[PDB]
Amino acid sequence: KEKHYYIGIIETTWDYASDHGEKKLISVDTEHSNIYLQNGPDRIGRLYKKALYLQYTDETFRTTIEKPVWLGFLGPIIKAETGDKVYVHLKNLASRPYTFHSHGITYYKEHEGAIYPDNTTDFQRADDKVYPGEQYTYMLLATEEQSPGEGDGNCVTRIYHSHIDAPKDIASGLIGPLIICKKDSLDKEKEKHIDREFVVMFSVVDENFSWYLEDNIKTYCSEPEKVDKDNEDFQQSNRMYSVNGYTFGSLSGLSMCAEDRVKWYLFGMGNEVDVHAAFFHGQALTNKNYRIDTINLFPATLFDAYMVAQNPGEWMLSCQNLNHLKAGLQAFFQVQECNKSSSKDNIRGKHVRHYYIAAEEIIWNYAPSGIDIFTKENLTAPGSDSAVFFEQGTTRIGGSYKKLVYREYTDASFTNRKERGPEEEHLGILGPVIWAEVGDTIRVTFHNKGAYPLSIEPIGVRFNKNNEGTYYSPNVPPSASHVAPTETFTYEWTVPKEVGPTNADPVCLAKMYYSAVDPTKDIFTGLIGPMKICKKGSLHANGRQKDVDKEFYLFPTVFDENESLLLEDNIRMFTTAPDQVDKEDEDFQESNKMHSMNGFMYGNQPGLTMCKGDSVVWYLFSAGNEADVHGIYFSGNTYLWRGERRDTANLFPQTSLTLHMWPDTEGTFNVECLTTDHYTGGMKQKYTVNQCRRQSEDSTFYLGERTYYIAAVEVEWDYSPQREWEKELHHLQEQNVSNAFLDKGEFYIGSKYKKVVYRQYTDSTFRVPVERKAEEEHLGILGPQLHADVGDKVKIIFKNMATRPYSIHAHGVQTESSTVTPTLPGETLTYVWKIPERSGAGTEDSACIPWAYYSTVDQVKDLYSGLIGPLIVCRRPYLKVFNPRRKLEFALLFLVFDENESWYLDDNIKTYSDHPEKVNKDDEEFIESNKMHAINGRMFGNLQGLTMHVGDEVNWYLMGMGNEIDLHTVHFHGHSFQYKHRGVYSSDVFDIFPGTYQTLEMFPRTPGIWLLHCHVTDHIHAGMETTYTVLQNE
Amino acid sequence: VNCETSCVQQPPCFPLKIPPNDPRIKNQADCIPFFRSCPACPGSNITIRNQINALTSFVDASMVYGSEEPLARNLRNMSNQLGLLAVNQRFQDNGRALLPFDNLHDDPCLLTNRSARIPCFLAGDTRSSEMPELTSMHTLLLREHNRLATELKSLNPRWDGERLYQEARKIVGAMVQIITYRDYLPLVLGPTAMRKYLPTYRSYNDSVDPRIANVFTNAFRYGHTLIQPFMFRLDNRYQPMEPNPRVPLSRVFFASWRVVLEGGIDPILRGLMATPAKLNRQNQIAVDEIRERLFEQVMRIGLDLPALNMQRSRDHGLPGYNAWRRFCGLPQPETVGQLGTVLRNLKLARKLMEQYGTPNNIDIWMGGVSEPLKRKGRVGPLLACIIGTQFRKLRDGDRFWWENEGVFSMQQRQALAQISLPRIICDNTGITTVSKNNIFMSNSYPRDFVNCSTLPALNLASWREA
Amino acid sequence: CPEQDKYRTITGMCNNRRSPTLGASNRAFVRWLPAEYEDGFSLPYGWTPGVKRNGFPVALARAVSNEIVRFPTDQLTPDQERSLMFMQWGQLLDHDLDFTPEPA
Ligand code: HEM
Ligand SMILES: *[C@@H]1O[C@H](CO)[C@@H](O[C@@H]2O[C@H](CO)[C@@H](O[C@@H]3O[C@H](CO)[C@@H](O)[C@H](O)[C@@H]3O)[C@H](O)[C@H]2NC(C)=O)[C@H](O)[C@H]1NC(C)=O
Ligand SMILES: *[C@@H]1O[C@H](CO)[C@@H](O)[C@H](O)[C@H]1NC(C)=O
Ligand SMILES: *[C@@H]1O[C@H](CO)[C@@H](O)[C@H](O)[C@H]1NC(C)=O
Ligand SMILES: *[C@@H]1O[C@H](CO)[C@@H](O)[C@H](O)[C@H]1NC(C)=O
Ligand SMILES: *[C@@H]1O[C@H](CO)[C@@H](O)[C@H](O)[C@H]1NC(C)=O
Ligand SMILES: [Cu+2]
Ligand SMILES: [Cu+2]
Ligand SMILES: [Cu+2]
Ligand SMILES: [Cu+2]
Ligand SMILES: [Cu+2]
Ligand SMILES: [Cu+2]
């Protein structure tokens, strides 16, 4: 099919919450909508003049195609099949130049629609600039490289938007979805064997980043002289927590039937705070044929869903994000009787599992011992990291908190306890682990004894309309929504095969339950509990898995006691002067914020013991807000998740994953969250492996015995050696134009920093450094590409030429001990790096996978001082026994380098600053002036070396490290990639977080240089972007 | 030093030099690549260099299940409690199971056919993809495991994944043993050598060393003399399958794509059953497909299998022909006329004396395969002795031998005694007409063929726990 | 080794209870005759130029193959009493018994 849609950009008045009456929302307190929607002489209101994509019938733009009303402000539904030459006729009636730039569809430079430096003539720059009163024809093509992968379904999620200054057009509204699908999956533009198709876009669309924002204020605000644009509360009222624009559940037309085979294309967009967790209330969904409930959406993240409509009623599609959930990021939908016409299962009353939990209040000390175990430093050490949290004084509470939490009882009387054995010793702040098989019927007798009404919200089981924990609506006695301080309610959940794990998922899956009256506040009180829904014929009578040795439940999260209802109590009870307690102070809020793992901080969680030969099945889950971006790391051990082998697991509010592991190294290891402000913030722990199997001389398997020479050397690091890529970009955007990171001004540092990196030397002399060849020139700040093949023995003969102690160590690589010894100024040491099968790729991993080799002297500060490098652990017959191989290998580290958190800040303040006597490290403007947003350590199209040929196989190893604000959405222009063994999955916008390491296989064909960037507003504007050169044959 | 691209004789390489007037390799500066086997004790000035067995010596179907714990786990289906071995996640052979692929970095598969993009298979042993006929046997046994685990789930519902897998593993392992000892070994050794070296089993002897002798790694390579120069594919009526009924063997090595894209494993098993093997004759030892073009598609130069065998015995420091003769209580010819008498072939004795100068120096494989075959057997007296001795030790020194008491019950042993390879093919493929027992003798269609319906299937009754 | 076990271990360990590694994987082969090396303990025959074995020059493996193994394929004799499956069980069986590792 030659498809010809006629896109048109207009400038219309858009209603964010189109009423019309009358809603009560989850945790929303009525008189709170007006924070974002009410119009006065200071607030802009609910209506906003915005740029919008519209579909038209004719080359003559006079009559529009009506858009689905659930689609909101998004551009018209564009679909493309494998080999379809889809044309796009864009017209711009708007007052400013825009564009059409599309994801995951092949285009020539004459039809990209994304402006940025790219040594190209005018003819190939006409698409890049479409002014008012202009028309352009965008010739697109869905190729074999671009179409859905093997493991994908028939259709996959894609997008399109205007691309002069990426985010500022999107925030102005210009964002439309594309639905890329296989060659013959569609009939009448409708996917074969699909009842309904709905597009869902979660985006806290920030109107402060919109062009028209300026012309939005002249009209609706009664006083355009009393308003500052640098005003946080004015900036808060304009951030629109919106799924398709319609905020506070104002989203309409979402009408679906019973047994309706419904497809969901959900994608996230915005900025750093756009940390999304979508969930369908009492609905079962499937991704890549895996059972899920909570999706995680982030800027430009492309994701699809298949759900069989079940359990009729009027439900909720809410944002997990507890801050987003208290900002009306919700949407109602109806499943109706029409009536079926099939049932399936079936089994309401069968296997009856009965639990008798009860809520109660206690003194919960986070670090019971009173000592940070990692160093033996105590919690009240002067000035220290842990001091700020664990100080008890005038206005600081200390280590103890009053917290309502779940605890299980044996029977209906609630008089005597079911006691916690050695297994339940690790749970702590977590309540009882509730577990079920497929076919069972779970009944929970909840006896609340706390002075606030509560409930229980299970995630992973089906529950009827009158057994739901939370309340929400389009329109005494003890119920399900409300369980008063004195009351008792009996829940009744159903768990069939329509909500249970399918063939593709492992035996048990990680799930969770939490009180659902005000989950933005109830959870932070500690009313969270682990769940474990499992298949038919699996668990023993006691509850565990057959032939699985240990079962662990870790719930790493930032417990915000400020959000706790027991805030007023904890103030009165532990602080010396309760009168002086300032709730609206930013130093006080960070104290009650307690970065923990199961309610334990700094390594105090026990009960995490296992032997050398156990079948360890970790069940993880998380909660919280846009700060909860986790990277839970297991040192010296590798787990298997869905045939993907990692050591670092990623969590976001309401994520729940089941990791499988088997210990091989004896020792006291670490459960440290890689997130650099959580780690020093209190999210690091200890798990132990004993010896319960005779030693027995092993090491009979050494198919390789390599030796490498690394050195932590110091040189001046230039983040932008030439700022010439910066000017052309801004110029081509008409932009102006200040740079907070690079410009020097009066006292700031600029681009040049004295940093410490690894480098490759010839030998033991450390006199002749290895020369970095053209193919390996893309490394930048990163060290030499270490290659290890399953069965190798990698020798690192490290030297520390730096002036202070550093250390070399890898991710997931097997070592001898549980400790990495630091090396000193002048010293030489040898670090044995063993490469077993478990340190290699999994059956669903691409044979060449990356690991991050780092430093253990100060993994927070050394990281930001410049210690990072890629380890490439491949399979076996890859090496060619030589070197040069026709499989281009690129490694890219996506990290916001916090120059503040270096060992050489005070040396950067003295050497390069014009006026050092005017630098206060505690200024946010200067702290921002030193967070250089750089891939591989190079900003604003500075990263060279990226060059490949037409008809090449180009490997991309993407490494994620850093902080809470280090969520990075890696996007390639002009071409997509393919993940999963054999390249079964395909995507052009990937999710890279502090801890994730992934190979991406790209098959390029179009010649020319292409924009390579993260897709986060701030980060893009922070120069986190480069290019790659695909050249045509000789 | 890279042994694959360099002809320099430095560790861990030992390249085979090229003689003048070589029928193929014209450049005497060239060589056939060769990696010395891994030493048991690297860099020792004390130990005498010995080599490592990466597998369990026992006949326990380790080629199916693996011999190391990481692999053995990864070969199982951990997505349920059915006790299954993982199957391919992209392809099926007419709705029947294949092997889980392994990622294409640059494994030998993506080399046999570039555009097909079929990687090597993953099995209990790293060599399952070497020839498609071998692949077909791996696939066959993997199907039989999953079939046995299924039937055992219905017969014993209380059983979990572990119990099902172990019980199905215990069966497959016993089936490999029965076929090997009952059908295969008498046809290798002949009646006389069978009676001598493999007497009737009595019970398990804990004083019998079950380890594979270094020499067996070379001596059992007699099978290289049985290789036909083609892979033979036959259709459902056992007629040549078009358009490639006879694929030269140098185009099938590591050709995993032929299993996946060229009709599955049925035309292969049929071709194995209804085509004769090559006979080992004294002037017709081994075909040029393995002598001249071994692994031609997956490396820089065609290898010479017989020459590698000889280079390997030296690498392993194996004594010569006469030393093994003396070990076996066999007379040692010292002159050319004596070697002529022992080989019952003077012309070949001469060729050997021209090469080696004395019979003492003849490499074990060459001397072994040169000896005239025993009646109703396919090795000579020296190989018979080495091969025979090895399998007696593997039988008598296995605690889990299917006939050893307590391994199986009496009724289980009785039920197992009814298995056969033909029946396994009947139970796990789209093939409905198979060879008459003995499968290793029959090979003429339709003379030596019966229908699957005539063969009783295995009775799992005595496996009911009740 | 446990007192009781109905199933084999994967490694083969504990099959012999008196010597539990016998037959197990990743162990040195047994030697039925003492090893014959050019230096008597490691170096293979044909490693050092001019160094004879048992008083005679070591023949190149490739030359023995050319003069003794090589035959024209049109002279090939099909076994009238063995099938190609006889060849294939042999290889399958060998792979149940031994694999001799080399450096990658
Ligand atoms: C598709 C046909 C076959 C091919 C391509 C093949 C190829 C090979 C190769 C390349 C080696 C290693 C050579 C070296 O570098 O020293 C080898 C060794 C071996 N093969 Fe063959 N083989 C096949 C058939 C057979 C048969 C039919 C038998 C026995 C009935 C056999 C017995 C073995 C044994 C016992 C070894 C030594 C294995 C070890 O311990 O590592 N082969 N073969
Ligand atoms: C079970 O297996 C073991 C091993 O085959 C049998 O032991 C073997 O028995 C023979 C004869 O009794 C031993 O040979 C002897 O050598 C000595 C020392 O040179 C010599 O003095 C005698 O002339 C005799 O030839 C052989 O060493 C021995 N092997 C081992 C490993 O101990 C055993 O008898 C078998 N038992 C049963 C019940 O079948
Ligand atoms: C583009 O061409 C210009 C010269 O016209 C040159 O500055 C530059 O090398 C080219 N761009 C890149 C980064 O390859
Ligand atoms: C930590 O040190 C303080 C003094 O700085 C001391 O009072 C306290 O005992 C120490 N902490 C503990 C609980 O050991
Ligand atoms: C496991 O078994 C199920 C049911 O037979 C099958 O569909 C699935 O493909 C298997 N999984 C693997 C990884 O082989
Ligand atoms: C390789 O496989 C393809 C199928 O992908 C087939 O059509 C082609 O004949 C094969 N190539 C050769 C050289 O046999
Ligand atoms: Cu985009
Ligand atoms: Cu964290
Ligand atoms: Cu980024
Ligand atoms: Cu793009
Ligand atoms: Cu872009
Ligand atoms: Cu920033």
PDB file of N, CA, C and O in Angstrom, chain A residues 66 99 168 225 539 579 613 683 713 850 945 999:
ATOM      1  N   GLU A  66     -11.934  13.618  11.585  1.00  0.00           N
ATOM      2  CA  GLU A  66     -12.035  13.615  13.048  1.00  0.00           C
ATOM      3  C   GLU A  66     -11.233  12.456  13.614  1.00  0.00           C
ATOM      4  O   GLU A  66     -11.104  11.411  12.971  1.00  0.00           O
ATOM      5  N   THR A  99       7.899  20.733  12.169  1.00  0.00           N
ATOM      6  CA  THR A  99       8.333  19.603  11.345  1.00  0.00           C
ATOM      7  C   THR A  99       7.528  18.330  11.591  1.00  0.00           C
ATOM      8  O   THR A  99       6.607  18.306  12.412  1.00  0.00           O
ATOM      9  N   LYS A 168      10.665  21.328  23.250  1.00  0.00           N
ATOM     10  CA  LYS A 168       9.850  22.548  23.278  1.00  0.00           C
ATOM     11  C   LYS A 168       8.649  22.531  22.318  1.00  0.00           C
ATOM     12  O   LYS A 168       7.663  23.231  22.543  1.00  0.00           O
ATOM     13  N   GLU A 225       1.841  41.426  34.704  1.00  0.00           N
ATOM     14  CA  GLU A 225       2.982  42.183  35.236  1.00  0.00           C
ATOM     15  C   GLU A 225       3.337  41.758  36.669  1.00  0.00           C
ATOM     16  O   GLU A 225       4.353  42.185  37.224  1.00  0.00           O
ATOM     17  N   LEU A 539       4.157 -25.223  44.244  1.00  0.00           N
ATOM     18  CA  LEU A 539       4.581 -24.984  45.617  1.00  0.00           C
ATOM     19  C   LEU A 539       4.330 -26.194  46.503  1.00  0.00           C
ATOM     20  O   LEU A 539       3.419 -26.981  46.245  1.00  0.00           O
ATOM     21  N   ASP A 579       7.979  22.473  68.909  1.00  0.00           N
ATOM     22  CA  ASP A 579       7.489  23.765  68.453  1.00  0.00           C
ATOM     23  C   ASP A 579       8.272  24.272  67.243  1.00  0.00           C
ATOM     24  O   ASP A 579       7.708  24.911  66.355  1.00  0.00           O
ATOM     25  N   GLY A 613      25.794 -23.513  46.449  1.00  0.00           N
ATOM     26  CA  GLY A 613      25.066 -24.546  45.703  1.00  0.00           C
ATOM     27  C   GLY A 613      23.546 -24.489  45.833  1.00  0.00           C
ATOM     28  O   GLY A 613      22.852 -25.457  45.494  1.00  0.00           O
ATOM     29  N   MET A 683      21.134   3.011  51.137  1.00  0.00           N
ATOM     30  CA  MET A 683      20.629   1.832  50.447  1.00  0.00           C
ATOM     31  C   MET A 683      21.770   0.907  50.017  1.00  0.00           C
ATOM     32  O   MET A 683      22.050   0.750  48.825  1.00  0.00           O
ATOM     33  N   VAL A 713      45.235   7.048  35.582  1.00  0.00           N
ATOM     34  CA  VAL A 713      46.065   8.213  35.306  1.00  0.00           C
ATOM     35  C   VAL A 713      45.253   9.509  35.416  1.00  0.00           C
ATOM     36  O   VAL A 713      44.027   9.494  35.288  1.00  0.00           O
ATOM     37  N   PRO A 850      27.991  -6.567  27.688  1.00  0.00           N
ATOM     38  CA  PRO A 850      28.909  -5.725  28.440  1.00  0.00           C
ATOM     39  C   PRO A 850      28.762  -5.826  29.968  1.00  0.00           C
ATOM     40  O   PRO A 850      27.659  -6.037  30.475  1.00  0.00           O
ATOM     41  N   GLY A 945      34.541   9.380  16.172  1.00  0.00           N
ATOM     42  CA  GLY A 945      34.843   7.953  16.094  1.00  0.00           C
ATOM     43  C   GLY A 945      33.705   7.070  15.624  1.00  0.00           C
ATOM     44  O   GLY A 945      33.945   6.007  15.044  1.00  0.00           O
ATOM     45  N   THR A 999      23.509  -5.121  25.045  1.00  0.00           N
ATOM     46  CA  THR A 999      23.974  -5.123  23.664  1.00  0.00           C
ATOM     47  C   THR A 999      22.802  -4.771  22.768  1.00  0.00           C
ATOM     48  O   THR A 999      21.688  -5.262  22.965  1.00  0.00           O
TER      49      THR A 999
END
